Enzyme design. Sequence first.
Site, PDB file in Angstrom:
ATOM      1  N   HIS A   1       0.666  -1.149   0.275  1.00 36.07           N
ATOM      2  CA  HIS A   1      -0.035  -0.169  -0.095  1.00 36.07           C
ATOM      3  C   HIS A   1       0.748   1.264   0.387  1.00 36.07           C
ATOM      4  CE1 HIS A   1      -3.703   2.186   0.341  1.00 36.07           C
ATOM      5  NE2 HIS A   1      -3.654   2.507   1.583  1.00 36.07           N
ATOM      6  N   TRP A   2       1.577   1.508   0.900  1.00 36.24           N
ATOM      7  CA  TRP A   2       2.908   2.447   0.386  1.00 36.24           C
ATOM      8  C   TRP A   2       3.888   2.300  -0.572  1.00 36.24           C
ATOM      9  CZ3 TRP A   2       4.788   2.467   7.295  1.00 36.24           C
ATOM     10  CH2 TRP A   2       3.897   2.676   7.682  1.00 36.24           C
TER      11      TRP A   2
HETATM   12  O1  LIG Z   1      -1.508   6.331   6.143  1.00 37.84           O
HETATM   13  C1  LIG Z   1      -1.447   5.483   6.013  1.00 37.84           C
HETATM   14  O2  LIG Z   1      -0.908   4.841   7.004  1.00 37.84           O
HETATM   15  C2  LIG Z   1      -1.899   4.535   5.062  1.00 37.84           C
HETATM   16  O3  LIG Z   1      -1.583   4.804   4.077  1.00 37.84           O
HETATM   17  C3  LIG Z   1      -3.552   4.096   5.115  1.00 37.84           C
HETATM   18  C4  LIG Z   1      -4.486   3.906   4.507  1.00 37.84           C
HETATM   19  C5  LIG Z   1      -5.745   3.889   5.337  1.00 37.84           C
HETATM   20  C6  LIG Z   1      -6.656   4.589   4.567  1.00 37.84           C
HETATM   21  O4  LIG Z   1      -6.761   5.828   4.062  1.00 37.84           O
HETATM   22  C7  LIG Z   1      -8.042   4.055   5.138  1.00 37.84           C
HETATM   23  C8  LIG Z   1      -9.509   4.915   5.288  1.00 37.84           C
HETATM   24  C9  LIG Z   1     -10.572   4.295   5.758  1.00 37.84           C
HETATM   25  C10 LIG Z   1     -11.006   3.011   5.199  1.00 37.84           C
HETATM   26  C11 LIG Z   1     -10.306   2.733   4.880  1.00 37.84           C
HETATM   27  C12 LIG Z   1      -8.787   2.637   4.161  1.00 37.84           C
END
Ligand SMILES: O=C([O-])C(=O)/C=C/CC(=O)c1ccccc1
Length: 283
Positions: A263-264
């Site tokens: 993801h990153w």
């Molecule tokens: O900031 C981070 O650690 C990262 O990229 C995580 C992202 C998850 C995200 O944006 C997310 C927000 C709401 C629901 C699902 C996913």
Amino acid sequence: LTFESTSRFAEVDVDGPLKLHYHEAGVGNDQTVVLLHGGGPGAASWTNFSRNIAVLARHFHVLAVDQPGYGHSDKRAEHGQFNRYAAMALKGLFDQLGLGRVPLVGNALGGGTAVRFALDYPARAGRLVLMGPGGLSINLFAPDPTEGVKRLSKFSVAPTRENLEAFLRVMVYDKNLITPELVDQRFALASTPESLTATRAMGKSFAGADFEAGMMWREVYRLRQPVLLIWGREDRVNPLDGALVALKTIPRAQLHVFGQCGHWVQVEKFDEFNKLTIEFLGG
Ligand SMILES: O=C([O-])C(=O)/C=C/CC(=O)c1ccccc1
């Protein structure tokens, strides 16, 4: 560049005063670019992008904004659908800073906000670079909630170091990146009262009366700008199948996928991501 040297605050109006923290760099560069970070626990502009910010600031005037609910921005306990709320805050910031039409780079939740902004204030968003973005993604094959989303929810319910580490381990392909120091640092930020409050408000806002605002895959066929979708092949939060509707329906879309990347993308494929972004934004 340091956290402190780049730090800025603005007060905008979103149903009343809303404090937004952001980082500014590359002042004196011609083209401004706004960066919007993801929604993980303890995530913020500096944590997410500090190293990319230094590189991009060589080319652009960088404004990396802590989205409401994160970092040092206000953390209200109530709000509408998150991306629309955050996009309203961003619109306030654009107006205050005198920004016209600006490109946006957003990962995950920040990608969702970038897209919501581009749809709600179409004249104001330029080219978009979106990394494993939420909002415009719809996981055609992966059952929802995905592994990543579940782990975030579990932490928000049971904010333990163990649960935080579990979440972080599904953010990356190379789990060696999830060091004890990273875990400890993110936990200190994620487990504060204000942060837990915010996280809750965020997840629940996607199921409110305005939930359709989160279903951006229904609307992005309206986007007129070039859009570069960037994905880690091994993204376990917003998996690769989530890219397909956006790729098909955004007329000027491109997609780049990196194998051996989670993801990153901005961390695991730092150099490649910075270069794609710089080239795409025209620098
Ligand atoms: O900031 C981070 O650690 C990262 O990229 C995580 C992202 C998850 C995200 O944006 C997310 C927000 C709401 C629901 C699902 C996913």
